[PDB]
Design a protein around this nucleic acid. Sequence first.
DNA 1: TGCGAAATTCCATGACA
DNA 2: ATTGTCATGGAATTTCGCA
DNA 3: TGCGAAATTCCATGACA
DNA 4: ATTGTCATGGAATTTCGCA
Lengths: 368, 368, 184, 184
Amino acid sequence: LDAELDQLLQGHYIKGYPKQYTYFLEDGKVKVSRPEGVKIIPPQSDRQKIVLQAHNLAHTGREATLLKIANLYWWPNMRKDVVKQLGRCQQCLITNASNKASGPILRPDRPQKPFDKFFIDYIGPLPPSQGYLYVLVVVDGMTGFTWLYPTKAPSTSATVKSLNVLTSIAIPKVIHSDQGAAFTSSTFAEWAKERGIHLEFSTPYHPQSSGKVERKNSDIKRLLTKLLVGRPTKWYDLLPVVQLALNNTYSPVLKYTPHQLLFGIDSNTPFANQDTLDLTREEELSLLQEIRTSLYHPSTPPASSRSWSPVVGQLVQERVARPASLRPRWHKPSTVLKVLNPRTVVILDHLGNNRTVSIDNLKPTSHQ
Amino acid sequence: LDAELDQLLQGHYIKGYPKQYTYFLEDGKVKVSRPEGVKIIPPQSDRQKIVLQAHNLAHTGREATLLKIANLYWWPNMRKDVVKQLGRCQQCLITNASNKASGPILRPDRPQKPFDKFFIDYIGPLPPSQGYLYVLVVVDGMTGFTWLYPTKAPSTSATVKSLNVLTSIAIPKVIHSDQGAAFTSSTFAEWAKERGIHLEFSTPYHPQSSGKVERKNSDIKRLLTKLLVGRPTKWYDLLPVVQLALNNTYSPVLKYTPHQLLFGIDSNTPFANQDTLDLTREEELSLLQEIRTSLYHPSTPPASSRSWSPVVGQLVQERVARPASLRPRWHKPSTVLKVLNPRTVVILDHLGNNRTVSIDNLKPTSHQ
Amino acid sequence: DRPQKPFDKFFIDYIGPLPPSQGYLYVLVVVDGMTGFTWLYPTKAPSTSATVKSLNVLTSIAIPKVIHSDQGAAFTSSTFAEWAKERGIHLEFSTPYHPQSSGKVERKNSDIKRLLTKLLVGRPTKWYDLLPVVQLALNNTYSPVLKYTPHQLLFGIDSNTPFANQDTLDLTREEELSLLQEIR
Amino acid sequence: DRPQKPFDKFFIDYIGPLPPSQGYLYVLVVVDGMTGFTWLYPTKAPSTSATVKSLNVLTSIAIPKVIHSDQGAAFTSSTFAEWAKERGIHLEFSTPYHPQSSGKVERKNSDIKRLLTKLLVGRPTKWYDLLPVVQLALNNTYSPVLKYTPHQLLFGIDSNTPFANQDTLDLTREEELSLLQEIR
DNA sequence: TGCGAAATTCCATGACA
DNA sequence: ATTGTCATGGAATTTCGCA
DNA sequence: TGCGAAATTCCATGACA
DNA sequence: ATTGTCATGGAATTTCGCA
Ligand SMILES: CCN1C[C@H](C)n2c(c(O)c3c(=O)n(Cc4ccc(F)c(Cl)c4)nc(C(=O)NC)c32)C1=O
Ligand SMILES: CCN1C[C@H](C)n2c(c(O)c3c(=O)n(Cc4ccc(F)c(Cl)c4)nc(C(=O)NC)c32)C1=O
Ligand SMILES: [Mg+2]
Ligand SMILES: [Mg+2]
Ligand SMILES: [Mg+2]
Ligand SMILES: [Mg+2]
Ligand SMILES: [Mg+2]
Ligand SMILES: [Mg+2]
Ligand SMILES: [N+]
Ligand SMILES: [N+]
Ligand SMILES: [Zn+2]
Ligand SMILES: [Zn+2]
């Protein structure tokens, strides 16, 4: 500080202060003659307060904070001192946006069999129809075969009623859902345990994880819309038609309908495929097992040039789910406990709880 | 029809029906023996109804409609008949999504001078503060210099009051705004005409067009948020501070603050730049004119591989602005009258009105 | 002749009246001919209306080429005929007083009746809730004649609820004496 | 000595009482020393409070290094001194009874008074609405001594409202006789 | 006439209802 | 009759200090 | 053994609150 | 303790019909 600056004034060389410049005293302040002009060298013990004042004018990042400082001052490695403060500004860390993309998505394996895994979700509220407001959508992961159920609410009780009708046909090993109240209730957990079904939840606020059913929701709304053009939105009576319509629609990439993938033969619907008319059921089920294993599988896409990847012990911040007006979009920093996979992590949150979270709802804390 | 199919049965060659296959009669229907199996050839006069039935099962596109048909039938060029119907299905055309990207954005020239062009917009409703709910934001296009005004409503009367205070300093040639009610009222037009100001409106529902002010809104909210962390959201008293804070913040790409671009010299704010202390005002204003013309300008980015570009006479569809639940997201097809630039067009809408519209709110109608 | 398949023929019939359960009195029984797969629907009456309402649910999942029944009023009504015609389903009736299905269907229908009777004694009123588990049992019950359950034949896979405990299906001495006392 | 600049010194002063306009009675006058640029603020009183409230608006746009005034109570209060100190503004007072500015400021202040007087006769009550246009006039008025208007000196550009019609600024014979009648 | 490190520039990311 | 923008912080590139 | 056109496959775009 | 998906219609590529 006043120590360093003394040695410097009497022509001695101190590390980080290039010897080729003339350092002088004026108005009781150490000054230097830099290409850009004459700047003040504050003593080390002053520097933190200067950076902070510059930064706080508008809570600026690296370069805009630096530019303010460089107006009056020079010292060795100013940006290192600038960055040090940015890493300690709680308001910047929790308010600023990320500028790093997540790593490329995983394309999980298609469940091997019908009934291995169900994906479920609510759509709504829709306009009232017969006093119903929601749709429970159930999609078999392997086949894409879908079941639709109108409900008055996205509730456990309505879900249980619907699943009781569905599970009359078959029991699935796993049901996958987002963390909506209907699916996270202990009533629903009891119901699953009673029947040997394992419940598997998406990371919170990451509907990509329930992508199978989410994508079916789109087709469901799309078909409902087309059918209701120029009529009032009386959709209740249409659900059964939509269900049947979608379950018998070809996926151009697969060349099969979800009904075909489930049963290996069309029922008595329009334009029924007749290719296996001469096979026995046994031969038919044989060809079916073969079809089911040879289905096209997409692979993980190229990473973006500025993706980041979670590392154990790293400081990361969870996205605020439903941020209020003028409130930060990010929670306080937290620590990566485990990396479950390149797109999913467990974090310890400062409270400190364990939370399983999508990398898409995280940013790495800046400036370490 | 029954004509063509007769000649075909008695071994004659008809164009489009490959001669190498054996065409026979069975159950009173012309059949052919195709690699995939035996298919029925319906008479031409039947074909439209078949395509339509196949299509209407689930309002499927090209390949999924085709796959249904190919289950039972064969005829020359089925997809041409499939596509013909898709182009005539009103419900598909107005409900389906586009799969073509807009052309790359324009980067309009920076206004040459302060006061050439103002960009204005409302932010809000925000939480009540002193009984105010909105902010009028005014951004000078050349400098980025910004004025903030709290209002109780996004109204013409509040806009007029605010602009009267602002225009005390200087009158701008053009004020640019989106088509919010406050800016499109005849009261506001009168007010502009009275003062020689030209009003210039964004294409509707395309806030990119007001990008200059929209981008400032973000910084305004961002700074307000940081300042209000851990306190109640009493933002009214902060507006003046934010205004001053932002107008004096460096843009790292430009190396100037909006205040500097407006005045060519810092006022008495913290870390004021001192580089022109020895110049006269005249020398200072001279360097300023030079700075203003040499500012960095971004250029139009590369087009995406599947962008489309509007052509006079083309059928295009306007995006529905605020679509209701289960209602189509696209209006009926309309016609491109003029191409104002590669990103903006005038369309005739079927009613038929002239509408100036962003290409981002258009898709080209599929299947011609 | 082409081999027999699922959805070729559904065999339908009513069971009841039964002791009221959630206000229901009958069960519409649907058995797939080829697989022996069973669907059950609780109704309030053996009417054409209740049949249509029930089959509308089933046929939003799969549509049979042929429905076969006896000459019950609900199945012979012209309303039920309009319904079938709309859906491209051919209707098939057995001659009056002389019901014919197939060995497979006859046996399955026997099991359904016997399995119902077993579970309604002791709780004659709770059968509505039991319908789902009855169906799983029936559908994951091994077929002596073919090597497979209906589930396996319909879906081409093993089930996640294998019913390895092929039950008595007979009334125990308790169930016999307290079934003769329930209607006494 | 370094050359004079905008924001080096703001000269401030009050005008009034005036005939009430939207409940306002005074005008706080701010003139930039170097450019001759004028900002006007309507107040309800020449108090420290009204001064602070007005200058808070101006200083959210630009902050002077020095404010100069006469020894008005509003400017000599310790509240106004706390305000200036908070903002890094040095305050400057002319000796009592002896007001000094510069030639430029003296002339500008003369124009302001004369231009106000001209417009308040006939409509002594509508001056609040007229403030914006008064300012544009003053600020786009050519300086005989320098070759430029205040606008040009402050922004380094031509204005979009050039006031090519340098007016009389004198009272016509009508305005003289009906100004002596307004206060009679 | 070239090295290691600091400075500056580059630029994808994301948010403006 | 109109039209994206630009703060941000790691990475990439250039310049600086010294020899 | 190669041509023109039809068929099929490819794949960016966008929407699932 | 978990993880994107897939209908869509122009374009690109492959195959077909015929020689
Ligand atoms: C309350 C529990 N909960 C959490 C959030 C509300 N959530 C729930 C949903 O079902 C969805 C949903 O369908 N989409 C639509 C969407 C958007 C982008 C996509 F990529 C995909 Cl696949 C789907 N979004 C959200 C959401 O997270 N919005 C911010 C969402 C849910 O139930
Ligand atoms: C009623 C007149 N009106 C029309 C629409 C409502 N609008 C108006 C706005 O001010 C905004 C606005 O700020 N943003 C935020 C935004 C989103 C993406 C961007 F790229 C950018 Cl630059 C800005 N969006 C919309 C909007 O169009 N949402 C669908 C918007 C407006 O006033
Ligand atoms: Mg959900
Ligand atoms: Mg969802
Ligand atoms: Mg707006
Ligand atoms: Mg806006
Ligand atoms: Mg009967
Ligand atoms: Mg005075
Ligand atoms: N997987
Ligand atoms: N331009
Ligand atoms: Zn900060
Ligand atoms: Zn359609």
